[PDB]
Design an enzyme around this catalytic site. Structure first.
Site, PDB file in Angstrom:
ATOM      1  N   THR A 159       0.752  -1.247   0.000  1.00  0.00           N
ATOM      2  CA  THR A 159       0.000   0.000   0.000  1.00  0.00           C
ATOM      3  C   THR A 159       0.792   1.313   0.000  1.00  0.00           C
ATOM      4  OG1 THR A 159      -2.263  -0.671   0.455  1.00  0.00           O
ATOM      5  CG2 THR A 159      -1.481   1.395   1.503  1.00  0.00           C
ATOM      6  N   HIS A 265      -6.577 -10.183   4.025  1.00  0.00           N
ATOM      7  CA  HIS A 265      -5.511 -10.830   4.777  1.00  0.00           C
ATOM      8  C   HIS A 265      -6.089 -11.929   5.659  1.00  0.00           C
ATOM      9  CE1 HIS A 265      -2.081  -8.319   3.783  1.00  0.00           C
ATOM     10  NE2 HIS A 265      -2.810  -7.236   3.992  1.00  0.00           N
ATOM     11  N   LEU A 691      17.634   4.477 -17.641  1.00  0.00           N
ATOM     12  CA  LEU A 691      17.878   5.496 -18.668  1.00  0.00           C
ATOM     13  C   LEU A 691      19.139   5.176 -19.490  1.00  0.00           C
ATOM     14  CD1 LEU A 691      17.420   8.684 -16.397  1.00  0.00           C
ATOM     15  CD2 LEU A 691      15.645   7.585 -17.771  1.00  0.00           C
ATOM     16  N   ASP A 693      22.622   4.988 -20.966  1.00  0.00           N
ATOM     17  CA  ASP A 693      23.927   5.407 -20.456  1.00  0.00           C
ATOM     18  C   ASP A 693      24.597   6.398 -21.419  1.00  0.00           C
ATOM     19  OD1 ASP A 693      23.748   3.810 -18.191  1.00  0.00           O
ATOM     20  OD2 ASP A 693      25.103   2.271 -18.937  1.00  0.00           O
TER      21      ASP A 693
HETATM   22  C1  LIG Z   1      10.770   8.818 -13.624  1.00  0.00           C
HETATM   23  O1  LIG Z   1      10.489  10.200 -13.569  1.00  0.00           O
HETATM   24  C2  LIG Z   1      11.397  10.898 -12.756  1.00  0.00           C
HETATM   25  C3  LIG Z   1      10.999  12.369 -12.720  1.00  0.00           C
HETATM   26  O2  LIG Z   1      11.129  12.942 -14.005  1.00  0.00           O
HETATM   27  C4  LIG Z   1      12.836  10.705 -13.226  1.00  0.00           C
HETATM   28  O3  LIG Z   1      13.623  11.036 -12.126  1.00  0.00           O
HETATM   29  C5  LIG Z   1      14.441  12.173 -12.444  1.00  0.00           C
HETATM   30  O4  LIG Z   1      15.562  11.833 -13.227  1.00  0.00           O
HETATM   31  C6  LIG Z   1      16.339  12.959 -13.568  1.00  0.00           C
HETATM   32  C7  LIG Z   1      17.439  12.572 -14.558  1.00  0.00           C
HETATM   33  O5  LIG Z   1      18.414  11.746 -13.949  1.00  0.00           O
HETATM   34  C8  LIG Z   1      16.911  13.598 -12.309  1.00  0.00           C
HETATM   35  O6  LIG Z   1      17.574  14.763 -12.724  1.00  0.00           O
HETATM   36  C9  LIG Z   1      18.712  15.065 -11.896  1.00  0.00           C
HETATM   37  O7  LIG Z   1      18.357  15.820 -10.757  1.00  0.00           O
HETATM   38  C10 LIG Z   1      19.472  16.076  -9.928  1.00  0.00           C
HETATM   39  C11 LIG Z   1      19.012  16.609  -8.567  1.00  0.00           C
HETATM   40  O8  LIG Z   1      17.604  16.775  -8.527  1.00  0.00           O
HETATM   41  C12 LIG Z   1      17.152  17.147  -7.200  1.00  0.00           C
HETATM   42  O9  LIG Z   1      16.102  18.087  -7.280  1.00  0.00           O
HETATM   43  C13 LIG Z   1      14.998  17.561  -7.987  1.00  0.00           C
HETATM   44  C14 LIG Z   1      14.002  18.666  -8.338  1.00  0.00           C
HETATM   45  O10 LIG Z   1      13.541  19.340  -7.182  1.00  0.00           O
HETATM   46  C15 LIG Z   1      14.356  16.449  -7.158  1.00  0.00           C
HETATM   47  O11 LIG Z   1      13.263  15.897  -7.861  1.00  0.00           O
HETATM   48  C16 LIG Z   1      15.369  15.348  -6.853  1.00  0.00           C
HETATM   49  O12 LIG Z   1      14.792  14.451  -5.911  1.00  0.00           O
HETATM   50  C17 LIG Z   1      15.538  13.212  -5.820  1.00  0.00           C
HETATM   51  O13 LIG Z   1      16.435  13.248  -4.731  1.00  0.00           O
HETATM   52  C18 LIG Z   1      15.784  13.531  -3.507  1.00  0.00           C
HETATM   53  C19 LIG Z   1      16.840  13.677  -2.413  1.00  0.00           C
HETATM   54  O14 LIG Z   1      17.704  12.557  -2.445  1.00  0.00           O
HETATM   55  C20 LIG Z   1      14.781  12.423  -3.165  1.00  0.00           C
HETATM   56  O15 LIG Z   1      14.023  12.769  -2.018  1.00  0.00           O
HETATM   57  C21 LIG Z   1      13.831  12.141  -4.325  1.00  0.00           C
HETATM   58  O16 LIG Z   1      13.135  10.943  -4.033  1.00  0.00           O
HETATM   59  C22 LIG Z   1      14.624  11.994  -5.618  1.00  0.00           C
HETATM   60  O17 LIG Z   1      15.397  10.805  -5.536  1.00  0.00           O
HETATM   61  C23 LIG Z   1      15.346  10.067  -6.773  1.00  0.00           C
HETATM   62  O18 LIG Z   1      16.162  10.639  -7.779  1.00  0.00           O
HETATM   63  C24 LIG Z   1      17.523  10.718  -7.407  1.00  0.00           C
HETATM   64  C25 LIG Z   1      18.315  11.432  -8.503  1.00  0.00           C
HETATM   65  O19 LIG Z   1      18.136  12.833  -8.393  1.00  0.00           O
HETATM   66  C26 LIG Z   1      18.069   9.311  -7.158  1.00  0.00           C
HETATM   67  O20 LIG Z   1      19.430   9.395  -6.798  1.00  0.00           O
HETATM   68  C27 LIG Z   1      17.243   8.625  -6.069  1.00  0.00           C
HETATM   69  O21 LIG Z   1      17.685   7.296  -5.861  1.00  0.00           O
HETATM   70  C28 LIG Z   1      15.793   8.630  -6.525  1.00  0.00           C
HETATM   71  O22 LIG Z   1      15.704   7.892  -7.723  1.00  0.00           O
HETATM   72  C29 LIG Z   1      16.689  15.950  -6.349  1.00  0.00           C
HETATM   73  O23 LIG Z   1      16.546  16.338  -4.994  1.00  0.00           O
HETATM   74  C30 LIG Z   1      20.407  17.027 -10.685  1.00  0.00           C
HETATM   75  O24 LIG Z   1      21.518  17.382  -9.896  1.00  0.00           O
HETATM   76  C31 LIG Z   1      20.895  16.346 -11.962  1.00  0.00           C
HETATM   77  O25 LIG Z   1      21.678  17.230 -12.742  1.00  0.00           O
HETATM   78  C32 LIG Z   1      19.701  15.840 -12.769  1.00  0.00           C
HETATM   79  O26 LIG Z   1      19.025  16.932 -13.360  1.00  0.00           O
HETATM   80  C33 LIG Z   1      15.799  13.978 -11.333  1.00  0.00           C
HETATM   81  O27 LIG Z   1      16.317  14.418 -10.090  1.00  0.00           O
HETATM   82  C34 LIG Z   1      14.838  12.811 -11.118  1.00  0.00           C
HETATM   83  N1  LIG Z   1      13.633  13.211 -10.402  1.00  0.00           N
HETATM   84  C35 LIG Z   1      13.090  12.452  -9.448  1.00  0.00           C
HETATM   85  C36 LIG Z   1      12.011  13.062  -8.591  1.00  0.00           C
HETATM   86  O28 LIG Z   1      13.437  11.289  -9.244  1.00  0.00           O
HETATM   87  C37 LIG Z   1      13.189   9.267 -13.613  1.00  0.00           C
HETATM   88  O29 LIG Z   1      14.395   9.204 -14.348  1.00  0.00           O
HETATM   89  C38 LIG Z   1      12.065   8.624 -14.412  1.00  0.00           C
HETATM   90  N2  LIG Z   1      12.373   7.222 -14.581  1.00  0.00           N
HETATM   91  C39 LIG Z   1      12.418   6.589 -15.752  1.00  0.00           C
HETATM   92  C40 LIG Z   1      12.872   5.156 -15.714  1.00  0.00           C
HETATM   93  O30 LIG Z   1      12.106   7.110 -16.820  1.00  0.00           O
HETATM   94 CA    CA Z   2      21.667   4.417 -17.193  1.00  0.00          CA
HETATM   95 ZN    ZN Z   3      -2.443  -5.591   2.995  1.00  0.00          ZN
END
Ligand SMILES: *[C@@H]1O[C@H](CO)[C@@H](O[C@@H]2O[C@H](CO)[C@@H](O[C@@H]3O[C@H](CO[C@H]4O[C@H](CO)[C@@H](O)[C@H](O[C@H]5O[C@H](CO)[C@@H](O)[C@H](O)[C@@H]5O[C@H]5O[C@H](CO)[C@@H](O)[C@H](O)[C@@H]5O)[C@@H]4O)[C@@H](O)[C@H](O)[C@@H]3O)[C@H](O)[C@H]2NC(C)=O)[C@H](O)[C@H]1NC(C)=O
Ligand code: CA
Ligand code: ZN
Ligand SMILES: *[C@@H]1O[C@H](CO)[C@@H](O[C@@H]2O[C@H](CO)[C@@H](O)[C@H](O)[C@H]2NC(C)=O)[C@H](O)[C@H]1NC(C)=O
Ligand SMILES: *[C@@H]1O[C@H](CO)[C@@H](O[C@@H]2O[C@H](CO)[C@@H](O)[C@H](O)[C@H]2NC(C)=O)[C@H](O)[C@H]1NC(C)=O
Ligand code: K
Ligand code: NA
Length: 805
Positions: A159, A265, A691, A693
């Site tokens: 959930t 459940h 994504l 590489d």
């Molecule tokens: C599914 O859709 C999402 C949204 O479009 C895609 O995820 C995005 O991918 C892009 C490209 O790699 C990332 O761009 C980079 O962003 C970083 C920093 O970005 C920061 O600020 C943004 C905007 O406010 C924020 O969304 C980001 O949030 C991430 O990190 C937070 C703190 O750790 C966390 O709370 C949040 O959950 C999120 O974590 C996720 O993404 C990070 C990578 O940023 C990853 O390490 C983690 O494990 C999670 O997956 C962040 O604070 C820039 O410095 C770079 O230059 C670059 O622009 C986006 O950040 C990212 N957005 C999100 C919300 O995940 C997926 O690629 C897409 N998936 C597919 C398969 O298509």
């Molecule tokens: Ca990749």
């Molecule tokens: Zn349940």
């Protein structure tokens, strides 16, 4: 600290953002222990129950009552939901005939149809079959509005990951809630269903609907309800909110029900005991609709009835124990049940030995009811790897089973039985895990069924329904336009970034020193002046236009009698290879003298070609071909299939899979589907983020060379939805299935791989089915740009997943 001494007078369920030291009166205060001292007596009234009775009509207003039946109740929005039926001769909404809602019919002051999201926990899709006999209100929404036979949740099918996915349109790996329980090694903290930690905002990423709405100046009701608030009160509160002044009234509302999850459940999905919970939910829905009708909003509001996941038959008797495989389970921590996630009990424990653990967990019982994966090896469709909260070692559990650390963790009763007969969390393509979707209201279509779709798609749609611009998410905006009467999203084709070259014959065999040898030659082809010209290749083999390359790179279109390809001068191999196989196509052999044949391609410089020497020297890596020699249209054409520009690096382990695919399955597909069009290619995802590489991220090359090794190989197989028309002469909608096969040095994933490929390859491929859209992300290519369908229809096609259930 919260000064509880304050009062909730005239403040009940106020939408006001209030914080310490002030005490609260909102629908979440109880969860924060910040409610004013009189919250319950003033706000959670219960007197006289939830329904008007004959003897209450016209009563004097007693503000102690749970809801009112007095004459003024209507204008105050205080009535019990059945007020008008009992007191004014109206009919229950459910007894009224369904009537098409062509435009919203809203009271003056409403600028747009409100949206109400009604979420039900653990509502298996197949429960809808119980029909109006059990759920007459829900059956009316379903039959009169827009419905899918089911909706695919995200993995894990529990959930918390699903509710936040619904709210954000993001995969759990991106939004952060990768489980109901999780450990974050950077925080060094554990998130649980129970406990305060989950209230800490650091866990929750992305941008959920209520934030998106607020930032764009649209008013949201509360999207969370303290468990202690009875459903009847939640409904009355929503109806109260809807009666607010124009300048306070929210545009979006959420109701949540913890049922039928709990009953599931306890009793299993097929227990006779499930009927009562279902009746109760339906009654709540009837309260909402009656209430809305009383408010004159029943042909104004859009309602979404949606589940977060399904429910499977699971009992104590079907538990695997890691202690049957591992010597010391007391040194590991296991997130257990319908999935497994493993880490050392002591964080960062140096003695933790994941390679040895996985080895002991691999195909060790013939009927083994789970399979270990390093997370990067999980099927790409699950999108479950790119987050630090996801343990490296995962166990995919077989439907109907549990995995536990040791028999100690299981608690049989004197009956030898367990208290539970149901659970969920399994692979999101499992039938039992599928959940429900119904949309009803002026913006949804009338009496329309739509194909199943994924819950990640809904965030865009809810934004559409509210006139909002969605934050970046994993939905494909437009893929669900077919659910809507209006407020559709007009998508736009992505712009091609790199134009291809069309190299002609320019070099001589004498120019090539690549170490490639071919024991035979087709001297006839050297006499074809128009060898490798466009000719009719594109129209026979590239049916939906060339894929657009959406990043900066250099590549060549190469033509052949049997296939066309987009050859990358940078990665030294095709980005894509496209070909059509007719229903009557003939399969042939690779002649013995051509077994090891590789031929230099005079269209491409030696410097932009692979060299067979690398392959000869690499004792682990072999090679394969993207267009298979097995399906050449003639012995003469077969020579094209051995070009170095058709070659890609493949472990012998993988070749067992790929050859079976090339030699047996493609023909079988062609035969079954009236011809197929095939596009195959490499994928590079070394950092497992789903994504494409960039060069710097590729971490493996053929020994002694700069030939990059793909982490996966894809194939997209298209034919005519109407199977009476051949794939190449299709007039209407398309049918597609795709795969993203992992390129691995062994077949440890396949417990039966010692047998003939006919006994295990297809099973592997089904597990690795994929959406074309998955492949687009992983390749930076854009498919189906030239077709006779609308862009919206194509978008739907690209999100389709052939599940094989
Ligand atoms: C599914 O859709 C999402 C949204 O479009 C895609 O995820 C995005 O991918 C892009 C490209 O790699 C990332 O761009 C980079 O962003 C970083 C920093 O970005 C920061 O600020 C943004 C905007 O406010 C924020 O969304 C980001 O949030 C991430 O990190 C937070 C703190 O750790 C966390 O709370 C949040 O959950 C999120 O974590 C996720 O993404 C990070 C990578 O940023 C990853 O390490 C983690 O494990 C999670 O997956 C962040 O604070 C820039 O410095 C770079 O230059 C670059 O622009 C986006 O950040 C990212 N957005 C999100 C919300 O995940 C997926 O690629 C897409 N998936 C597919 C398969 O298509
Ligand atoms: Ca990749
Ligand atoms: Zn349940
Ligand atoms: C906590 O809340 C109570 C009630 O709001 C506060 O009590 C009031 O204090 C003011 C200031 O001295 C008095 O004038 C009022 O008569 C009190 N209200 C009532 C209803 O008795 C109390 O001050 C708050 N505690 C704080 C501010 O820390
Ligand atoms: C993997 O399983 C094997 C058993 O197949 C375990 O082997 C045991 O190793 C211990 C010492 O570690 C010996 O005392 C036992 O004699 C072994 N058992 C048998 C029956 O051979 C091995 O420990 C397991 N490894 C892990 C990582 O759990
Ligand atoms: K080799
Ligand atoms: Na194997």
């Amino acid at each position: 600290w919260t000064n509880t001494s304050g009062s909730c007078k005239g403040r009940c369920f106020e939408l006001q953002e209030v914080g310490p030291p002030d005490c609260r009166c909102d629908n979440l205060c109880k969860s924060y222990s910040s409610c004013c001292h009189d919250f319950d007596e003033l706000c959670l009234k219960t007197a006289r129950g939830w329904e008007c009775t004959k003897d209450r009509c016209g009563e004097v207003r007693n503000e102690e009552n749970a809801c009112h039946c007095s004459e003024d109740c209507l204008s105050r929005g205080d009535c019990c939901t059945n007020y008008q039926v009992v007191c004014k001769g109206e009919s229950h909404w459910v007894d009224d005939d369904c009537e098409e809602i062509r435009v919203p019919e809203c009271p003056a002051g409403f600028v747009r149809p409100p949206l109400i999201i009604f979420s039900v926990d653990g509502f298996r899709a197949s429960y809808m079959k119980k029909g109006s006999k059990v759920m007459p209100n829900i059956e009316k929404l379903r039959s009169c509005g827009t419905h899918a036979p089911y909706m695919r949740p995200v993995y894990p099918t529990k959930t918390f990951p699903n509710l936040y996915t619904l709210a954000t349109g993001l995969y759990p790996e991106s939004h952060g809630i990768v489980g109901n329980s999780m450990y974050d090694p950077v925080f060094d903290a554990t998130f649980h269903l129970r406990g305060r930690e989950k209230f800490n905002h650091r866990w929750w990423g992305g941008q959920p609907l209520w934030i998106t709405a607020t930032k764009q100046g649209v008013r949201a009701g509360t999207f969370f309800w303290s468990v202690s608030i009875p459903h009847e009160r939640r409904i009355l509160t929503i109806l109260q909110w809807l009666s607010l002044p124009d300048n306070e009234r929210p545009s979006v509302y959420a109701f949540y029900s913890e049922q039928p999850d709990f009953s599931g459940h306890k009793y299993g999905p097929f227990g006779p005991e499930m009927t009562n919970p279902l009746r109760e939910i339906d009654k709540t829905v009837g309260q909402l609709m009656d209430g809305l009708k009383q408010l004159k909003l029943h042909r104004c509001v859009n309602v979404i009835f949606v589940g977060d996941h399904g429910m499977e038959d699971v009992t104590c008797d079907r538990t695997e124990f890691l202690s049957n495989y591992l010597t010391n389970v007391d040194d590991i921590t296991l997130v257990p049940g319908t999935l497994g996630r493993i880490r050392p009990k002591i964080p960062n424990n140096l003695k933790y030995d994941p390679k040895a653990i996985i080895a002991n967990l691999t195909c060790k019982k013939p009927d083994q009811h789970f399979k270990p994966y390093m997370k990067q090896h999980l099927p790409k469709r699950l999108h479950y790897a790119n987050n630090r909260r996801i343990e490296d070692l995962h166990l995919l559990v077989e439907r109907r089973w549990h995995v536990a650390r040791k028999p100690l963790d299981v608690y049989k009763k004197p009956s030898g039985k367990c208290f539970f007969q149901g659970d969920h969390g399994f692979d999101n393509k499992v039938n039992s895990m599928q959940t429900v979707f119904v949309g009803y209201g002026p913006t949804f279509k009338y009496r329309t069924k739509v194909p199943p779709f994924e819950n990640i798609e809904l965030y865009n749609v809810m934004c559409d329904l509210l006139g909002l611009k969605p934050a970046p998410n994993n939905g494909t905006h437009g893929s669900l336009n077919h659910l809507l009467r209006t407020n559709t999203f007009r998508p736009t084709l992505p712009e091609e970034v790199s134009r291809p070259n069309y190299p002609g014959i320019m070099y001589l065999q004498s120019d090539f020193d690549l170490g490639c040898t071919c024991d035979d030659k087709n001297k006839l082809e050297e006499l074809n002046k128009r060898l490798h010209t466009k000719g009719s290749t594109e129209e026979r083999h590239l049916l939906y236009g060339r894929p657009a390359v959406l990043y900066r790179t250099s590549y060549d279109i190469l033509y052949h009698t049997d296939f066309e390809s987009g050859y990358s001068e940078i990665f030294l191999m095709p980005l894509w290879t496209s070909y059509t196989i007719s229903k009557q196509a003939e399969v042939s052999s690779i002649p013995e003298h051509l077994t090891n044949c590789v031929r230099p391609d005079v269209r491409v410089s030696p410097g932009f070609s692979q060299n067979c020497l690398a392959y000869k020297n690499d004792k682990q890596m072999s090679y394969g071909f993207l267009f298979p020699p097995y399906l050449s249209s003639s012995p003469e054409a077969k020579y094209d299939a051995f070009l170095v520009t058709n070659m890609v690096p493949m472990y012998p382990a993988f070749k067992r899979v790929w050859t079976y695919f090339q030699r047996v399955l493609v023909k079988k597909y062609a035969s079954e589907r009236n011809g197929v069009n095939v596009i195959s290619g490499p994928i590079f995802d070394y950092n497992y983020n789903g994504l494409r590489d960039i060069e710097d991220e590729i971490k493996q090359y053929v020994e002694g060379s700069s030939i990059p090794v793909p982490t996966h190989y894809y194939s997209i197989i298209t034919s005519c939805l109407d199977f009476t028309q051949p794939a190449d002469k299709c007039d209407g909608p398309l049918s597609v299935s795709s795969f993203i096969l992992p390129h691995r040095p062994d077949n440890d994933e396949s417990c039966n791989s010692s047998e003939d490929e006919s006994k295990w390859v297809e099973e592997l491929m089904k597990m690795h089915t994929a959406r074309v859209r998955d492949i687009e992300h992983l390749t930076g290519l854009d498919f189906y740009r030239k077709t006779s369908r609308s862009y919206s229809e194509i978008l739907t096609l690209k999100t389709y997943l052939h599940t094989y259930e």
